[PDB]
Design a protein around this ligand. Structure first.
Ligand SMILES: Nc1ncnc2c1ncn2[C@@H]1O[C@H](COP(=O)(O)O)[C@@H](O)[C@H]1O
Ligand SMILES: [Mg+2]
Ligand SMILES: [Mg+2]
Length: 200
């Protein structure tokens, strides 16, 4: 059955970008915070949250980081820091109607890094509580592996290859990564896949 009933009213696609360097910067800090709200049945994008985030420990973006992500210094200068962005997310969640206990939603990420490592690690560094809706998620690589019977090698690029999808936008742009996750999800649902929480 194409586009079966799903277990969630909405899927919240998320894919951070963070400060980085060669060798890696320490600590890393979130600089782009995108969320796509997908209709739970059709996987169509219905709303977008998108903020760049001002890094504080390493406030100047390295050449490497700007090359990797396309994010330039002017995009993070004058932005709120992560504490404020998380408060903006809460407000966005509330206005979207996602804070209703009877509206079921779940974050979807490519890998576990974003919500298993990046966000809790920075919130712990900053002394900030992590909102409970960030504590469960679907790892698309794992979902893809159940849907297709195989483990993708390199993330979104190989998942698009497996499904004959053209890449959307620029790799390592947070918002464009989110659109590819959404596109891959829509295809898995077309093939009949029912999504399930994978986080433990
Ligand atoms: N090849 C790489 N080298 C160093 N850091 C990376 C690399 N790829 C990703 N990162 C870091 O991981 C974050 C998330 O990666 P991604 O969703 O693949 O763009 C990036 O914003 C960088 O901070
Ligand atoms: Mg990512
Ligand atoms: Mg990304």
């Amino acid at each position: 059955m194409s586009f079966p009933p799903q277990r969630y009213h909405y899927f919240l696609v998320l894919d951070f970008e963070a400060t980085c360097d060669k060798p890696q910067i320490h600590p890393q800090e979130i600089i782009e915070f995108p969320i796509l709200k997908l209709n739970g049945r059709t996987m169509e994008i219905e709303s977008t949250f998108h903020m760049y985030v001002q890094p504080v420990v390493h406030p100047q973006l390295t050449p490497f980081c700007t090359e990797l992500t396309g994010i330039i210094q002017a995009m993070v200068d004058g932005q709120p820091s992560l504490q404020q962005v998380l408060e903006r997310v809460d407000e966005w969640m509330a206005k979207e109607g996602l804070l209703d206990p009877n509206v079921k939603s779940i974050f979807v990420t490519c890998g576990d890094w974003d919500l298993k490592v990046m966000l809790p690690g920075q919130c712990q560094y900053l002394g900030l509580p992590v909102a409970d809706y960030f504590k469960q998620w679907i790892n698309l690589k794992k979902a893809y592996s159940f849907a297709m019977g195989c483990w993708p090698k390199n993330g979104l690029l190989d998942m698009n290859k497996g499904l004959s999808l053209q890449h959307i936008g620029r790799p390592h742009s947070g918002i464009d990564d989110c659109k590819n996750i959404a596109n891959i999800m829509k295809t898995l649902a077309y093939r009949g896949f029912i999504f399930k929480q994978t986080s433990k």
